[PDB]
Amino acid sequence: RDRIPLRIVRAESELSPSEKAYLNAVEKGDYASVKKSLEEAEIYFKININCIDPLGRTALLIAIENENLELIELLLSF
Amino acid sequence: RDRIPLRIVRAESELSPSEKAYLNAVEKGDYASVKKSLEEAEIYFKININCIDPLGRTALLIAIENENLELIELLLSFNVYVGDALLHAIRKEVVGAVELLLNHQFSEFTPDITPIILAAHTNNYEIIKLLVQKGVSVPRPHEVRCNCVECVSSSDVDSLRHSRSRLNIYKALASPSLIALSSEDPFLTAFQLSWELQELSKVENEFKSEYEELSRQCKQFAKDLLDQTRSSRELEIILNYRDDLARLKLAIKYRQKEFVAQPNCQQLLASRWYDEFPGWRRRHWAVKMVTCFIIGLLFPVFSVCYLIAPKSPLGLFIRKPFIKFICHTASYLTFLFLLLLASQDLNRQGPPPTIVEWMILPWVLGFIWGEIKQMWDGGLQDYIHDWWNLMDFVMNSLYLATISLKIVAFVKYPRESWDMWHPTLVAEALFAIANIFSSLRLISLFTANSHLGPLQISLGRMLLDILKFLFIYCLVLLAFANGLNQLYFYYEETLTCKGIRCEKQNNAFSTLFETLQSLFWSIFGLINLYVTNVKAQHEFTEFVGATMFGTYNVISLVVLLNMLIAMMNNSYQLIADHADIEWKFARTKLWMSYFEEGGTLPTPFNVIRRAADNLRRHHQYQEVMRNLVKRYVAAMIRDAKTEEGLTEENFKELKQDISSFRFEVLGLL
Ligand SMILES: CCCCCCCCCCCCCCCC(=O)OC[C@H](COP(=O)(O)O)OC(=O)CCCCCCCCCCCCCCC
Ligand SMILES: CC(C)CCC[C@@H](C)[C@H]1CC[C@H]2[C@@H]3CC=C4C[C@@H](OC(=O)CCC(=O)O)CC[C@]4(C)[C@H]3CC[C@]12C
Ligand SMILES: [Ca+2]
Ligand SMILES: [Zn+2]
């Protein structure tokens, strides 16, 4: 064997592109994008509030270390 | 010419003012200006998309290092040529590596550097995860000492490139994130990788510090991965895993001094050491030595109870590792007391005394049988890797020689009329040497104690340095002995005593052996100054010989001894910062010596379904490893963005972001 075939042994669970878009919307700090993502998360759709990153960062936590108090209030309101 | 005319020697093609303004628009964050410049670059104008700065900064590169994703997407939207810009995004640890991956000379990176190698060098978990999800492969390095056709061909073509590529591959494999993400068993991978990198540092004399740092990184990663244990059940799952403490034995085998000497590992080893002993260490010291003495005098009854009833409670009290350690210590102390009794004569044949030496022989045969048994299991490499094993092998060889010499003297043969090589005399001399070695073996028991332990470990560690300085001093002694013997061998006289071991020291430098002895004994001042005189009135020869003696004394006492003191100062300051780690590793080895069921009896008495279980153990170990890897990744990510500090790159990023916001606001109004 010539090359080491690197893979992921601890596969975990990946996320939907809509969920990843919501997570990086919380990461960027845009108020309107997170508000719209949580509007489509109000109805029972793909985007859920209880979304857990493979890194382990829930969107509330991403708001917590971003020091965005308004984003934390918006998340805790839902 | 009284002035130096400064000119540029390495000139380039430079940039046009339009291209310079375009690069400034890339730098500042004028999105409208770069869009207009690119639109003008679609038509046949001066500005080209793949322009090259004199510093080698393509517009995509300076867009990448400013962390502006919109600019990067703008250049990749117009098919700007992409060379090693993915490597620049990886080295900068920039989230635009995704856009660089999905997008369809002078290089700042070595040509053997691939994206996965550089991402592992940077130790970024997200970029490594992205590249492994996209599908990457690290080339497999060969064995440490191998001579295949490919390696010698690459060394003949380019030894520098081959060594750099091998070092880059081993730097990529040794990163904590790649082991945490792509390895089945991160602990075994870290152990074997540190072992391989240590062998590479030994083999590759150059790049030795790099491989030693990589091995230290692997060991430190293994220690941090073990540090994430939250329950004792997980610790017992990890340490007792085999593919009994099998993983702890493996970590001892791979010299993982940081995986061991961990508070959780030491807590488990202490729980297995004082087994069924509630609150042993939480007692007064006087009661501890009292009960240690009580067990010490009670060693033979426990040994007999084990030999006659292993299932008895008193036959299971010896099975405790601490109790059996006290038992073995008491046995060795009783043997040394018997040696002291033997130390406290007109017959050529010496029979054993009817009391003292006759029970001494079972300890000697027990030591011999234990040494052969310990040499049979484990191998001979670890036998020679332990200096105490060399010491007790020497002691047992001397004891066997004394036994054979006593037998020979009994079956073949006043004291003052004996030959100097009489077998009784040689037997007594070797018995005294073996007594010295047996009583010097007691320093190995200092490892159990918490006060003399680290001291004994450090003072045993600087012995290699002692041997190096002894080599240097032996060369100096040989030189001066050669010179003094050459000068003084013409004046040899033949007087009952001839040498330096009488009241009137004479013929000190007449023989080469006597010259060596006289120069050896001059360190301690036991050689007087009349040994440099001759019978004749040759004052020049006496003065030159005394000058040799003075020069040798000056070197070996003022110069060499103080250099030895200085180098023991440096060594002790270097090894006192890890004294607890080495002491706890050696104490763990001493404990796990007594943990096993075999060799429970002391030396005077020591001569007298599966697939389902393996699958369940593998699943439990994989779940524990998944939790540990998640905890380690989270901890090092939280550690990573705290202790790093602020460079000038993030200040430039702040300036570029504020300028981009300002220019977007200006574009809006
Ligand atoms: C091996 C490589 C590393 C060492 C390299 C050499 C480094 C050392 C060189 C030393 C050279 C010899 C010096 C003279 C010795 C000698 O033979 O000296 C021998 C003679 C004595 O002659 P007799 O032995 O015949 O009486 O000394 C004298 O004649 C007295 C006057 C000269 C004294 C010189 C002393 C110099 C300093 C030496 C002592 C320092 C002690 C300091 C204590 C605080
Ligand atoms: C002339 C003969 C009789 C020898 C005289 C000296 C011995 C009686 C001494 C010298 C060093 C001593 C040892 C030094 C250190 C230790 C460790 C200490 O035990 C521990 O620390 C056990 C582990 C723990 O407590 O965690 C007490 C026993 C022992 C083996 C001592 C036993 C008694 C020894 C052999
Ligand atoms: Ca031994
Ligand atoms: Zn090879």
Helix, strand, coil shares of chain B, percent, nearest 5, are 70, 0, 30
Sign of CA dihedral B516, B521, B523, B525: negative
Ligand 4 centroid from CA B662, angstroms:
57
Report whether residue B82 contacts ligand 1, using a CB cutoff of 6 Å.
no
Supply B147's token pair.
């001579």
Ligand 3 (ion): residues with CB under 5 Å are: B 389, 392
Residue B393, token pair as written in the block: 């092998």
Interatomic CA distance for residues B481 and B195, integer angstroms: 45
Q: Please give the number of the atom of ligand 2 that sits closest to the Cα of B452.
A: 15
Q: Where are the beta strands (DSSP E) in B607-664?
A: none
SS3 A52: strand
* Residues A37, A25: Cα–Cα separation, whole Å: 8
Task: State how far the Cα of A11 lies from the Cα of B266, in Å rounded to an integer.
Answer: 33
Long-range Cβ contact pairs of B235-240 (< 8 A, separation 24 or more):
B235/B264, B235/B265, B235/B268, B236/B268, B237/B620, B237/B621, B237/B624, B238/B187, B238/B621, B238/B624, B238/B628, B239/B265, B239/B268
Amino acid at position B215, single letter: S
CA distances to A37, A55, B128 from A15, rounded to whole Å, are 15, 11, 18
Q: How far apart are alpha carbons A47 and A41 in whole angstroms?
A: 5
Which of B193, B115, B234 lies closest to B629, judged by CA? B234
Minimal Cβ distance to A5: which of B133, B137, B625: B137
* Residues B84, B107 contacting (CB under 8 angstroms): yes
Helix intervals (H) in B183-262: 186-203, 208-226, 232-239, 246-253
Contact B198, B212 (CB under 8 A): yes
- Give the ligand with the smallest distance to the CA of B366: 3
Residue B392, annotated as binding a ligand: yes
- Give CA–CA dist B151/B166, Å, rounded: 11
CA–CA separation, B122 vs B126, rounded Å?
Answer: 11
- The answer to whether B220 and B160 have CB atoms below 8 angstroms apart is no
Does residue B151 have a known ligand-binding role?
Answer: yes
**Residues facing residue A3 across a β-bridge:** B139
Residue B137 to residue A4, Cβ atoms within 8 A: yes
Residues of A in contact with B634 (CB under 8 A): 55-56
* Cβ atoms of residues A25 and A37 within 8 Å: yes
Cα torsion for B195, B197, B199, B203, to the nearest 10°?
A: 180
Q: Strands A3-5, B137-139: parallel, antiparallel or unpaired by DSSP?
A: antiparallel
User: Do B584 and B266 contact (CB within 8 A), yes or no?
Assistant: yes
- Structure obtained using: cryo-EM
End-to-end CA distance of chain B: 59
Is residue A55 within 8 Å of B633, Cβ to Cβ? yes
Q: Contact at 8 Å (CB) between B325 and B319?
A: no
Interior/surface letters B358-390, b for 16+ CB within 10 angstroms, e for the rest = eebebbbbbbbebbeebeeeeeeeeeeeeeebe
